[PDB]
Design a protein around this ligand. Structure first.
Ligand code: FMN
Ligand code: FMN
Ligand code: FMN
Ligand code: FMN
Lengths: 357, 327, 356, 326
């Protein structure tokens, strides 16, 4: 089993990273282009990022749902900045309008300055206490229960969501995080645990950690991975495109990005930014696992670079560890969605093998 | 100048009040029908209600924005249950995707049981304190400022909205409320003050109160009214339809000439309705307009059929651009 | 089995017949309203009329196909004014974009003045010769054959439709006509024979004719009926609305419009006007069958008027004669599509009973 | 004035010519992609080809009209296979639903085998006689006249179009053709004369001919050109992409930057502008100096290359195309 997602660039798009040259602004029209492309090409869904640098995830996802037929939308909720009952009603309404195409990404917020901008003044442990109480209220209200809950951070009395969702018991919960609080939270409440594009050995131990903690709770969780991809017909064209992607990045721009990630109280960003020491040389940290993307962009940090057979082999490597969800992205997102679907889909398991043609 | 709104029945629709007979459930398809009808007929916008009995307003408004061309959306934000910075980013995205067709309805929440369900445990006095601090943060972030604010209820540091809205300085703020705290809040921060369909004498005194307080802040606010409408070609058919609307209801409803309080028997949209022929309905509208009312938010049962009825019977009797739309 | 269609008013729409009062002009927005209404309410499809008084059928149906999900479109082809090969390519393209939601209505043209405006100068017998040769080419090209055909009117050499249709062997052919030439054409080539709303006795004899002629060709055809509908919650309200529909109808426009039918070369339009003759009194030619629509409108001329039980009872009577397709319409077309679907659907067979 | 069009690949699309490798089949979803791309990027319109190898132009153009806001559609009418009165009603209906975004491309048909498949058995001279009579009826019915016309090929009596078009007097007529009959037909009835991508010397001679014949009829016509385009950031990548496009086929540069490789197989245009943005814009300015105001471009594949041209060449073109990128 394999689910292949794409990515909506709700923070901006272009041909190069770091520079504003060749930039492609995010508009309703361009978001329709990328979303309808993923829908028509046969992707399972698209991941929509959240944060201060993005347009709002819920407004975007609701606007594109009536314009697509099969595509699913992985939309992020952020506990601590919105009431859980209200968030559940939003999930229910959007899940009903799409007839069951909504997926939820639990995001705790790794930037304390951004959290303070939203009014949240919580430590790392407190963000996960809030998220724990948030998910318990959210999951139960979507199951029709009138929820009474008085915790350390959240308190609701007679919380109800009158419109039940289409997917049962609730829209599936996807979650990413590398700290101990995150691995405990994922093992207890979530349905799919997400990890960034670390080398296969490092992801296998994280999976073994989350999988063991889930067994002590009597649960089993599925796993997913987030990766950029730069695939061409030959390996030579791929590595040239990886070089060209980061050509217009001054050495001073690399250092300023490597030090703005150090303010993030995020263990996931800690590891992803530790794969590269800002060095512009030797960015290939593993066979066909380039790390030059994380030189300037937050969030994801690595990319699969190579020919179609090389990229499909790395996907099978992650899949043999138990990973069943793959969230890909590329620059620019419209052109590269066609590139991946035409070069890599026939090399993937069904139904992606029979989609190309 | 006059703005005529319609109403999106996100809490459900039907032919009769009280009964589940003739009920029409809220789906994407039926919401598309009413909104696209209001867009093509030439209504200025639609009011979208909020509450535990409604689907979420922001999901609905965002889903209908790419399907319409000129229709505006009056969407409700509720302070106390969402961060003001997050609320502003949502307003910016919807205003940008709609190319300036977003309108904001400030709702404080009047039902304490429903507020307790969302996690807010505030008195009536505290609910307006939160709204006051909410709107100050909300207005400033949408104007490009990096906002630092420490109040009695809300606290933000370095709050920014990185995407500026289309409408300047921000999407217009519509607000309704009868308390003294509401009239002070309206005079200081809001752009359009809304009132229910009370008789003309009662509406004139509320307007004079807000208008006097607004002058002390060196500003002027516009006024709007919310009214159900049951208009037919003759006065006899209109009152017959009003009786049919409330037939399956358990035990004098005309509080003013052609102002019927029948639609207030259940917690639906409003509480009073204009009932009569086209000349009678336009005469009551002109009476409210002479008091300073410029926004009219109408509704009917069911909302699709009645949107066409009002636009074809009353629009030619209203000022421009509504006179030249019917043709 | 039963298929219930609605009607797209590409003629124009309104609340009353004869007068421009309460008129509702045909726009893209309003056609989107009616089509999306029929789509969401669960109608099988919509019939789109053709003619000089209509916007083009193919442009409208193609524009609404990407805006609807399940609704089917009964679109008219007119042999004699367009090449059959091109017409087949048009059908294939629209059937592919809709993923198998195209239906074809063969229209031969009953108005000779309108036909001469299109460049066709054919007698009644010749219009059916052209249509017969047209349909033979059209059906075969859509089945993948490179067709050579030399007839009395049409000639093609190496006619091919490179893009195959979704529905096999081709989008179903619906046809209406009352002449003897029409009954032969329907029995030989078409899939569904359509008739206007004549009384049940008269439709049974027309059905018995086509069904007997079809057996001699080794075929069987299904049957459909076209009717207006004025249904309300009570029978008194229905007849009150039927009266109001024709209130602004003067005796001078009855002659001016019904004598326009006297020039039509149509046999289905001849027996339609034979039910009223312009007399406004006594328009209920059968229990709940009311011919007031035919007092100014061409085409359909009768309407089912009554309460939901009465209207559903007349529908079951037509179904017992072998009729499986019902094409309904109402004034105005948006409001009345909801009225019929909410008052009559729960009384009809599945899937219309469980749709609400 | 300058109008820049794109191209809807209703005959099929792909990455390479000759081989089925990298082929992209024509579907509703992919046609929506190309059309909505042209709409958002700011192209004046798209040309839709016609013929036995294409899906029907009128079904495609009508299906995309409600899904776009500003993009215009250059749709082909074919005299001899459809009634002119019927053709005018189609044009009127589509022009009204689009609120004045319809453009008409009159095509007479150069392939006689395909014409016999449609039921037309006419010589070259006869196809232009029919088109002459077709356009006279078509133009007059769209202007509200009750038309009586009896010619060698067409006959109508009381031909009327009850729904008037949005654009007056009618949707503009675009026409392409190189024969003596074609230049006469263009000089008398059409609004824009179209030419293939020949070198500037050859295009100037055809333009001077049509313009001379039009002056004797008291008319003036505008001119347009059809060209494939392979533009990259550098000239080396452009010519390498030109090589890759035609490698799987069993030198080719006919003029400065005018590469005739795309003409080895039929599929829109026969020559292509190949080079960097300054080279491509210089040839565009060179053709514009001859009087050409409409430019119909295409690329392989049509989605990706529509963005490439709009992002690399638009800032080098006159307004409003210079100010669209930002
Ligand atoms: C696949 C994936 C997607 C994520 N998306 C977002 C996002 O959209 N916004 C965000 O603020 N954080 C995002 N994160 C980061 C986490 O949600 C979380 O905020 C951060 O890792 C802090 O948790 P930690 O300290 O346990 O790593 C994402 C993480 C992963 C693995
Ligand atoms: C025109 C108008 C529209 C309103 N819309 C809503 C609504 O959609 N949802 C809601 O919960 N309350 C709505 N309200 C009520 C508000 O919550 C209002 O703050 C409430 O009446 C409490 O104010 P008050 O105590 O000063 O009267 C509306 C009020 C008015 C006048
Ligand atoms: C259901 C139905 C739909 C029809 N639709 C059309 C139409 O759209 N345009 C038209 O000219 N005639 C239409 N007709 C009439 C016939 O196609 C034809 O023009 C007329 O009946 C002449 O045939 P006849 O003399 O054999 O009866 C329709 C007939 C029926 C029964
Ligand atoms: C810009 C342009 C576009 C054309 N498009 C088409 C088309 O879509 N289909 C077609 O069959 N012919 C097309 N043609 C060819 C002409 O319609 C015409 O049939 C051809 O030039 C033969 O006529 P001639 O003898 O005058 O050269 C096009 C020509 C030009 C210049």
């Amino acid at each position: 089993s394999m689910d292949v997602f794409w990515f909506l660039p709700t923070h901006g798009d272009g041909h190069y990273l770091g520079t504003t040259q060749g930039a492609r602004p995010v508009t309703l029209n361009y978001l329709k282009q990328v979303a309808q492309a993923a829908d028509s090409l046969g992707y399972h869904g698209v991941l929509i990022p959240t944060g201060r640098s993005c347009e709002d995830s819920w407004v975007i996802a609701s606007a594109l749902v009536p314009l697509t037929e099969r595509l699913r939308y992985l939309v992020a909720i952020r506990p601590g900045i919105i009431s859980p009952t209200v968030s559940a009603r939003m999930a229910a309404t959007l899940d009903r309008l799409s007839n069951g195409r909504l997926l939820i990404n639990v995001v705790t917020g790794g930037d304390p300055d951004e959290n303070r901008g939203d009014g949240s003044f919580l430590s790392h442990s407190e963000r996960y206490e809030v998220t724990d109480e948030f998910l318990k209220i959210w999951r139960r209200v979507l199951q029709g229960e009138a929820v009474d809950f008085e915790g350390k951070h959240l308190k609701v009395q007679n919380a109800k969501a009158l419109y039940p969702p289409v997917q049962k018991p609730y829209p599936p919960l996807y979650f990413g995080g590398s700290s101990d609080a995150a691995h405990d939270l994922a093992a207890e409440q979530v349905d799919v645990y997400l990890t960034w594009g670390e080398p296969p050995a490092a992801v296998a131990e994280k999976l073994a950690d989350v999988r063991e903690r889930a067994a002590r709770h009597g649960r089993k969780v599925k796993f997913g991975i987030r990766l950029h991809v730069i695939v061409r017909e030959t390996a030579e064209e791929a590595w040239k495109a990886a070089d060209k992607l980061i050509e217009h990045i001054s050495d001073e721009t690399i250092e300023a990005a490597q030090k703005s990630f150090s303010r993030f109280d995020s263990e996931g960003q800690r590891r992803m930014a530790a794969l590269h020491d800002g060095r512009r040389d030797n960015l290939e940290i593993a066979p066909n696992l380039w790390a030059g993307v994380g030189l300037v962009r937050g969030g994801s940090g690595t990319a699969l670079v190579g020919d179609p057979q090389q990229v499909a082999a790395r996907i099978k490597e992650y899949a043999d560890l138990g990973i069943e969800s793959f969230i890909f992205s590329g620059y620019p997102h419209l052109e590269e969605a066609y590139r991946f679907a035409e070069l890599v889909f026939p090399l993937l398991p069904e139904p992606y093998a029979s989609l190309a043609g």
